[PDB]
Amino acid sequence: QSMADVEKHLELGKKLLAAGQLADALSQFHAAVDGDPDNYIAYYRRATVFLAMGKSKAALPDLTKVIQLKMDFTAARLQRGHLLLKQGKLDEAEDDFKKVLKSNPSENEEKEAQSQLIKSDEMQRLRSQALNAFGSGDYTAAIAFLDKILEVCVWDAELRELRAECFIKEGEPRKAISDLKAASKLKNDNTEAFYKISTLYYQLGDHELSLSEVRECLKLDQDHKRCFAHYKQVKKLNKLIESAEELIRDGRYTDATSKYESVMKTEPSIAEYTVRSKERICHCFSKDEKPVEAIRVCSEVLQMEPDNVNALKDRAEAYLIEEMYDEAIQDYETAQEHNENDQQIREGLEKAQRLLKQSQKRDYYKILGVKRNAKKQEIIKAYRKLALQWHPDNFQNEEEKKKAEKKFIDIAAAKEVLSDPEMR
């Protein structure tokens, strides 16, 4: 009987782990475990790969099987203790940590075991303090407690969740993502955990992520009436925004604008969706050279976010097409306060201020200038007419008159200022 298959599985398995493979190492140790359910080494190796990869649930059962099989082998009960601690299942961990110091206590192990029950004895104390502050209603308090507790028990989902809840109760919902993602990772098959986060990503408009998560919820359970419900939603909503963006890449702005209005229409509750939608619309008009509307919208946007860099920038490019430099600069200058080194913002000013000066100094060819660097005789030709034309004698009413004077003052101003050394 060549039980090589079960043997090779382990060799190949161990080499893979050693190479850093984990994923494949595991595919192998699974083989060995189903190969010889009775063997203890396998259960150990699988368990070590679970651990290596961030998988806490999956490892525990594999460790305790080892214990049961080779009841003697203590490093394993020590391994269990660690896990149960990373898990924050403190009582169970202590009860294991002690039976290590008690049954086959020895060498370096004694130190590890002992130093851990000290963390554990403070942890036990810390969760109480945390759960205290929370129950009584102090969130900021309980946050700081949990922060620490979570350095030692990195894989304690129930607490992470609680911490996440603190953040959101404190109105810092973006901070909760971190914990909620983890919590779902940890439990691996918890239907309500995936909702919890997907729901959150969604509130924050992280709509792409939200969708992948709720896919998960469903991959676990086809029939969840509530995951599905949410899924129809994000799908529809992502489909639209992902579509809109592609149209903004093709410069089909008007089409993108339409798209984004159906976006607001589909998700009208959450502010973040109308806002970001509007931003892009303000962007859509701007890049489409429709400045009036561009201005109209970016105004609404900066009203909700005066610090919205993109919005400022696009509305600036619009002011340009209208030649409103005092405004355009003011905007870039506001965006400056937000981005110190962004080339787009820096280059904004330099282009604008350049044009600002050339605008301030009035042009003479502006009055006619049939040719840039027109011949001195050709100039006089149209001047005679425009001197004939723009003389206040030509029309009766004063209001009009005063206005032509300005043209007259200038038409002649050209003459003296262009002939002789002047002009260049």
Numbering used by the authors: 32 to 455
Article sentences:
The crystal structure reveals P58IPK to be an elongated protein, with the J domain attached to the very end of the TPR domain via a flexible linker. From the structure we can identify the probable binding site for BiP based on the position of the conserved histidine-proline-aspartate (HPD) motif which is necessary for Hsp40-Hsp70 interactions.
Crystal form 1 (P312) has one chain in the asymmetric unit and crystal form 2 (H32) has three chains. If chain A of crystal form 2 is superimposed on the single chain in crystal form 1, chains B and C are shifted only 2–4 Å and 1–2 Å, respectively, from symmetry-generated chains in the other space-group. The crystals have estimated solvent content of approximately 72% in crystal form 1 and 71% in crystal form 2. The structure in the two crystal forms is very similar, with root mean square deviation (RMSD) of 0.8 Å (using chain A from crystal form 2). In both crystal forms, the electron density in the TPR domain is of particularly high quality for the moderate resolution, while the density for the J domain is weaker. PISA suggests the oligomeric state to be monomeric in crystal form 2, but identifies a potential trimer, generated by the crystallographic symmetry, in crystal form 1.
